[PDB]
Ligand binder design. Structure first.
Ligand code: HEM
Ligand SMILES: CC(C)Cc1ccc([C@H](C)C(=O)N[C@@H](Cc2ccccc2)C(=O)O)cc1
Length: 453
């Protein structure tokens, strides 16, 4: 059927529609206008945006469709390489890293990371306990400090000490500016102009800073022989059961950059969006706070206590439904095929899955899709297959899902235990798009319940 397509700009086709601060939000508004699928053309490129569970459940069939690197992921690949996130399924290093790393990221493995996660979580709570009266909290800034430090410590036993600085660690400055450069290049009608020559030189310098710090950490761990329980050790020792080969030090670097991108961007957004929805739904906040206080009886939460924070877990899943912080993923057709019995696709045709739109499909969620009701996640088996995908699909799904939800549950748990929150500015949601989504300018006041650590 003659697929809907948004408005065009002559020779540039649809491309200048992405010439905005908020491209994901612009494409969500196009999906509201045009429905479950639309064509998006750019000079030398065609993509098809999917919004309905009906079509996305077919796209998630691994026999017909495989992960595609979007233009965003091709640009991140200049510094994240053949790390798990920016590698094609058919590259030897994808399956090799997947087999080696999977056990390191299982629910079982989280008992190992727990103590380290607590270390950074206690630093967050102590910062907030130490604020004077009528001082406020910058939420996404503090959550980003936390998530970044938690992966640094759990990933390679490195302390970024974000809670001791206004000015972020040099490596972080280079990563943030590389990601900015990577997302900026999407929109540019004339890639290799002379304004961009200056950006190019900055980008190559930012790639070098990340490479140098990570290569030094790998070299220093090799020389020490210390067997810390972190991902770096697992990666230096570990053999793929398939090939019987370990990762070489170049790929280990790419994995570690990959992890620090994920810490920085995704998990901090989840925690920021959850706190936002809690202050805007006080009945739901009171339910989550009642659970935190009943379950988290010890000054230091244990692994087991975090596992019994069911309603905090439902809050995090409901925040991920409304604002999935990594809001899209891309597929290509392995062979000629028909999508939904009505859209023919040629081998190599791209689909973009718009996760925020999948998560608003009224045929799945009912007619109150815009309300924050964690009760939707009361019973996991009641959610239809491929209706809820904040962590992507099949073998190319987020390897960090258990790590993210453990950290977010522990931290949100401790935040609701230790503080009452005031939306003192009546914050209006403003969603900044980098690689990910974050509520920009989200500020609150925390009143300590004066419970000891
Ligand atoms: C709330 C937090 C997170 C969300 C919403 C999220 C979401 C996602 C999504 C949607 C993908 C699939 C991307 C695609 O198909 O192109 C993915 C992949 C990935 N995520 Fe995450 N992620 C989160 C946290 C993390 C964390 C904490 C880590 C690591 C410490 C991580 C590491 C990865 C890796 C390595 C992949 C690539 C998996 C593969 O292809 O083998 N993520 N994540
Ligand atoms: C980590 C993930 C979420 C990175 C990402 C961020 C944002 C997007 C959005 C939805 C998107 O549509 N990106 C497209 C942009 C595009 C550029 C030129 C021509 C056609 C399309 C893409 O990156 O391929 C896709 C992926």
């Amino acid at each position: 059927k003659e697929m809907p397509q948004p408005k065009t700009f002559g020779e540039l086709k649809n491309l200048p529609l992405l010439n905005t601060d908020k491209p994901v939000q612009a494409l969500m508004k196009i999906a509201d206008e045009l429905g479950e699928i639309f064509k998006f053309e750019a000079p030398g490129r065609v993509t098809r945006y999917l919004s309905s569970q009906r079509l996305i459940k077919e796209a998630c069939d691994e026999s017909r469709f495989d992960k595609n690197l979007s233009q965003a992921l091709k640009f991140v690949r200049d510094f994240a390489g053949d790390g798990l996130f920016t590698s094609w399924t058919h590259e030897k290093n994808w399956k090799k890293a997947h087999n080696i790393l999977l056990p390191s990221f299982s629910q079982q493995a989280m008992k190992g990371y727990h103590a380290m996660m607590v270390d950074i979580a206690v630093q967050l709570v102590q910062k907030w306990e130490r604020l004077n009266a009528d001082e406020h909290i910058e939420v996404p800034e503090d959550m980003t400090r936390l998530t970044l430090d938690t992966i640094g410590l759990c990933g390679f036993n490195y302390r970024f000490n974000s809670f001791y600085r206004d000015q972020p660690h040099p490596f972080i400055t280079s990563m943030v500016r590389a990601l900015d450069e990577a997302m900026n290049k999407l929109q540019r009608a004339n890639p290799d102009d002379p304004a961009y020559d200056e950006n190019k030189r900055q980008f190559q310098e930012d790639i070098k800073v990340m490479n140098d710090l990570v290569d030094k950490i790998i070299a220093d761990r090799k020389a020490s022989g210390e067997q810390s329980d972190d991902l770096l050790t697992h990666m230096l020792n570990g053999k793929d059961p398939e090939t019987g080969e370990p990762l070489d030090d170049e790929n280990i670097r790419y994995q570690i950059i990959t992890f620090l991108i994920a810490g920085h961007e995704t998990t901090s957004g989840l925690l920021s969006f959850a706190l936002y929805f809690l202050v805007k739904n006080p009945h739901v906040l009171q339910k989550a706070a009642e659970e935190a206080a009943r379950v988290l009886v010890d000054p230091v939460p244990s692994y087991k206590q975090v596992k019994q924070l069911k309603y905090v877990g439902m809050v995090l899943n409901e925040a991920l439904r409304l604002w999935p912080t990594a809001p899209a993923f891309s597929l290509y057709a392995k062979e000629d095929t028909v999508l939904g019995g009505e859209y023919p696709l040629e081998k190599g045709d791209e689909l973009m899955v718009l996760i925020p739109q999948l998560h608003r499909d009224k045929t799945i969620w009912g007619d109150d899709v815009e309300e924050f009701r964690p009760e939707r996640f009361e019973n996991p088996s009641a959610i239809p297959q491929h209706a809820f995908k904040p962590f992507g699909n099949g073998q190319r799904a987020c390897i960090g899902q258990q790590f993210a939800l453990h950290e977010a549950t522990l931290v949100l748990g401790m935040m609701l235990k230790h503080f009452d929150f005031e939306d003192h500015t009546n914050y209006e949601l403003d969603i900044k798009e980098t690689l990910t989504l974050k509520p920009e300018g989200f500020v609150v006041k925390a009143k300590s319940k004066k419970i000891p650590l």
